[PDB]
Design a protein around this nucleic acid. Structure first.
Ligand SMILES: [Mg+2]
Ligand SMILES: [Mg+2]
Ligand SMILES: [Mg+2]
Ligand SMILES: [Mg+2]
Ligand SMILES: [Mg+2]
Ligand SMILES: [Mg+2]
Ligand SMILES: [Mg+2]
Ligand SMILES: [Mg+2]
Ligand SMILES: [Mg+2]
Ligand SMILES: [Mg+2]
Ligand SMILES: [Mg+2]
Ligand SMILES: [Mg+2]
Ligand SMILES: [Mg+2]
Ligand SMILES: [Mg+2]
Ligand SMILES: [Mg+2]
Ligand SMILES: [Mg+2]
Ligand SMILES: [Mg+2]
Ligand SMILES: [Mg+2]
Ligand SMILES: [Mg+2]
Lengths: 170, 125, 104, 52, 186
RNA sequence: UAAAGCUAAAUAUAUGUAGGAGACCGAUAGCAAACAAGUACCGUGAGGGAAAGAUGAAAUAGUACUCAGGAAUGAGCAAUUAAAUAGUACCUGAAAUCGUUAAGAUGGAACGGAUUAAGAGAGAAAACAAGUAAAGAGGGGAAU
RNA sequence: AUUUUAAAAUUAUUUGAAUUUUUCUUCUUAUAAUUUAAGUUGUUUCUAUACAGUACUUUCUUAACCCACUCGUCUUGAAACACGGACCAAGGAGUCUAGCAAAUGUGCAAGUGUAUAUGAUUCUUUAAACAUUUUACGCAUAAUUAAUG
RNA sequence: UUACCGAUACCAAGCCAUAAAAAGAAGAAAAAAUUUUUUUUUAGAAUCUUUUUAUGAGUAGAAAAUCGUGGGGU
């Protein structure tokens, strides 16, 4: 895991190996999540899967629409990536389970590190035009998540100068 | 600019970076002299990278001296230390990067006995 | 008749197997000869070129007084040795010996 | 591409070779030269070193 | 700027340091350079220069030629910065005292027989450091076969330059431009 | 001494098999082929013709067990290892590219040069103090 | 480690002149010192009674003033509305032989080169090295002629 | 009419390189301590050392000295 931690007794990790979801959507979701209390994040994810609150697409925002929900995050564009959220939800659940297994109270857990990397793409073919084969690759991703429990030198001359200054001020 | 410390005059603290090394990763900063018509660096237009030149050279007397005023001598082995028993003010040891910790320690000890400065005593410390 | 000191110097100014020259910090070219006082690579100081020469060394732990025809020995003792077989340089040698003594 | 018909050997004049040999012999003679060449010869008396 | 030739810097056209790595020859040049500088004797300087020169400009001087040169002033010592070769074409050899860089063995033998002396350069220096009673001599320099191809090119009229040709015989460079009968001549 | 004929040796050998060598190549090199290579695959066909080596000393150490999971996987107070960010896509693991965090900048480019400054990092081998004294911990060398 | 001397100059002395009668008048007889000679020396602080600090040196990072056009390329002329270059890594282009020449090195020199091949008490290296029989050939040493010469 | 500002040109000084030129095969200097200890140096590498003076643009091109990679003998 990419973080600096010090005390892993207070942390709960969780990963997804090679998730068959789009990196960009899931990245966006992760961004939306990060620095949330775990339960709140979970709630948010559930809302997005039932299309009630959007995830705002701020970085990878080419063509993404113009939802009414994005006002909540001071933004115009947003989406409700379902599959991505589901995958993320699963990994959140895993994290929660891990925390439980340890002695971490899930109320006090913050997502300190939600990392999404892109994984090696699965290759397929698409057929175009005048007998031209093109790639039709997935962009799967690795997800790492870390929840975490939360609550000179003087000198004589210099000294003299200082004293003088003080006197002057007085 | 010029970087006086005492009698050591350095005319050019800045490294000469390759032209456009800043623009393309593939072009490494190691100075390479631009041949090529229309280069602008070759032609020495105001505001472009400078060309290293023999004018920049350090005075023959202070040339390879470090801020110490001592010529650096790299040392792999105790035997090598011995040439500088008669030159312990003019030369300063650097212990070779590949020397083992025990051997390094030994070398350091020898240097102390000789009164010769070691510029990397702290390696593996 | 075929060999002389100058000739020797010419032969060995470059291709020695006691010369060590610093690649890093380019100024400095030392001769680590058994019979070189100051360790300069000069004909007027090297053990190989000079006929008679009397260096102090470390060899194998214990300090050794060396002479040129070739002899080996082991402060007062050193002085005595110098007096015996000697030909400013003596002073230098003595100084060197002091430094050597310091080592262990 | 490298070819077998590169010139591998060099002819050296017989005389030159002989001269070289002689000079090497001479060198082997001379103590200082031997020392330079790298041998630990400080404890040998005579360097044209001859044995029964 | 400055309107100068070669910008300030003085061209010197010749040799500088001998390119040879011949330790003995280096020693010799050292010596004679020293002598030149101290004993500003001309002679010494000349000797030094000749020692520095390349092999074609130290051509071999034939015993006969040496003898001829010594003819008028005897006893004084001919010095030759190159090789001296022997001459089968000589019959008699006088009592010659010669300094040279090299004596071919037979020449040396001949000299010895003559009851002469073969001196090397160091010996000469020892004897005659200002070159008193010496005579510098050169062998035939432009007598070299390479030099016969130089000058005006064969083709230019009145040139006595040998063409570079595979061989001799009528078949090789003896027709058009070599005889009035085939267009022109030379 | 033609119009009949034979005949060993010295000579040649990029084919095959078997040996042996190298100032040769070192996995985009070297044979096309270090590997189930004239293989897969393409072409009606004559033909064309790849890619692809490395865990560790040992898998007779190849991931037991527990928790969460539909499962993949993940986590561990659990476990082989010297080491698993050596986990079989396994040596090292560069760059392009992308992620996380921080710091900074941000009026239709960006970067750059020369010159300081302001920050933020590193640093004492010139950038102070040789010796002398008191007593600890070491090591040496000699003198008899 | 003797052109950081010599002299010049200056100061304080000493002998003799001079017409610019002069506390800087000049030369010169002698002697000492000095610097105006004979390229910066001192004094006092500070860093500092410090072991790295916020100071000091240095890297990067931002600004700011001024400047700065896409490199490569053919071209009289490229920032070009000329072409090639999305990026990165690795690969990637005057080489090897033959024969000639010049240059330079080296040996020997009216010679030189032991060519094939032989020989050895040569045999991991040795496919090198060594050797040359108890007037070979090359190139040179002579040219010239279409030629007998 | 002055005065001013104003180049990589000019001038003075420094340093680098190039070129040439001089010239070169033996010795105590000082400070600090307290008359003796300690501290630094006590040079002589000819393609090298010391000093001098001038000069320094550059494509095609030429040369020299350097730097680095794979392997060989030492
Ligand atoms: Mg142009
Ligand atoms: Mg010019
Ligand atoms: Mg028949
Ligand atoms: Mg037949
Ligand atoms: Mg291959
Ligand atoms: Mg270990
Ligand atoms: Mg690792
Ligand atoms: Mg390994
Ligand atoms: Mg790996
Ligand atoms: Mg806008
Ligand atoms: Mg501008
Ligand atoms: Mg045109
Ligand atoms: Mg252009
Ligand atoms: Mg066009
Ligand atoms: Mg075109
Ligand atoms: Mg294009
Ligand atoms: Mg391309
Ligand atoms: Mg030649
Ligand atoms: Mg130029």
């Amino acid at each position: 895991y990419a973080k600096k931690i010090r005390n892993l007794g207070k942390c709960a990790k969780g990963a997804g190996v090679d998730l068959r979801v789009h990196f960009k959507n899931t990245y966006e979701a992760a961004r939306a999540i990060r620095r949330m209390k775990l339960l709140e994040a979970k709630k948010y994810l559930n809302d997005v899967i039932e299309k009630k609150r959007c995830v705002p697409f701020r970085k990878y925002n080419g063509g993404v629409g113009r939802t009414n929900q994005a006002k909540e995050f001071n933004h115009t564009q947003g989406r409700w990536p379902a599959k991505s959220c589901k995958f993320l939800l699963n990994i959140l659940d895993n994290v929660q389970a891990n925390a439980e297994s340890r002695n971490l109270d899930v109320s006090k857990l913050r997502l300190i590190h939600v990392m999404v990397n892109k994984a090696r793409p699965g290759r397929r073919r698409t057929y175009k035009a005048h007998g031209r084969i093109n790639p039709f690759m997935s962009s799967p991703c690795h997800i790492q998540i870390i929840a975490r429990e939360i609550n000179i030198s003087n000198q004589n001359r210099l000294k003299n100068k200082s004293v003088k200054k003080q006197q002057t001020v007085q | 600019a010029v970087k006086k410390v005492g009698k050591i005059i350095k005319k050019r603290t800045k490294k000469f970076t390759r032209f456009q090394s800043n623009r393309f990763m593939r072009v490494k900063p190691a100075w390479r002299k631009p041949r090529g018509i229309d280069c602008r660096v070759r032609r020495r237009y105001k505001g472009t990278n400078l060309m290293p030149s023999i004018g920049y050279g350090s005075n023959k007397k202070t040339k390879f001296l470090l801020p110490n005023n001592k010529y650096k001598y790299v040392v792999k082995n105790v035997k090598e230390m011995e040439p500088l028993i008669m030159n312990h003010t003019k030369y300063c040891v650097q212990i070779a990067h590949n020397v083992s910790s025990k051997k390094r320690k030994q070398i350091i000890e020898r240097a102390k006995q000789m009164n010769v400065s070691v510029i990397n005593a702290k390696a593996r410390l | 008749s075929n060999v002389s000191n100058a000739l020797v110097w010419e032969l060995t100014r470059k291709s020695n197997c006691f010369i060590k020259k610093n690649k890093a910090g380019k100024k400095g070219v030392f001769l680590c000869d058994p019979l070189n006082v100051n360790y300069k690579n000069t004909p007027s100081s090297s053990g190989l070129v000079k006929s008679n020469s009397t260096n102090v060394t470390l060899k194998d732990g214990k300090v050794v007084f060396s002479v040129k025809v070739n002899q080996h020995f082991k402060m007062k003792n050193v002085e005595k040795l110098l007096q015996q077989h000697g030909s400013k340089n003596k002073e230098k040698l003595l100084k060197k010996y002091k430094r050597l003594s310091k080592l262990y | 591409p490298t070819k077998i018909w590169r010139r591998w050997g060099r002819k050296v004049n017989l005389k030159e070779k002989r001269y070289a040999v002689c000079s090497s012999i001479a060198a082997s003679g001379v103590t200082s030269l031997v020392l330079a060449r790298g041998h630990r010869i400080s404890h040998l008396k005579e360097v044209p070193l001859v044995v029964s | 700027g400055i309107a100068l030739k070669n910008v300030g810097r003085i061209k010197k056209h010749g040799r500088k340091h001998l390119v040879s790595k011949n330790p003995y020859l280096r020693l010799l040049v050292k010596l004679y350079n020293f002598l030149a500088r101290r004993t500003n004797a001309n002679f010494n300087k000349i000797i030094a220069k000749r020692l520095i020169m390349p092999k074609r400009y130290r051509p071999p001087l034939s015993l006969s030629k040496l003898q001829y040169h010594m003819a008028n002033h005897p006893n004084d010592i001919a010095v030759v910065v190159g090789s001296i070769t022997d001459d089968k074409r000589l019959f008699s050899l006088k009592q010659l005292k010669v300094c040279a860089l090299r004596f071919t063995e037979t020449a040396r033998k001949r000299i010895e027989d003559a009851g002469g002396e073969c001196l090397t350069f160091d010996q000469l220096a020892l004897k005659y450091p200002t070159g008193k009673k010496c005579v510098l001599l050169r062998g035939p320099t432009k007598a070299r076969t390479a030099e016969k191809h130089f000058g005006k090119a064969p083709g230019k009229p009145k040139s006595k330059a040998r063409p570079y040709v595979r061989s001799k015989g009528r078949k090789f460079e003896k027709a058009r431009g070599r005889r009035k009968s085939r267009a022109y001549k030379k």
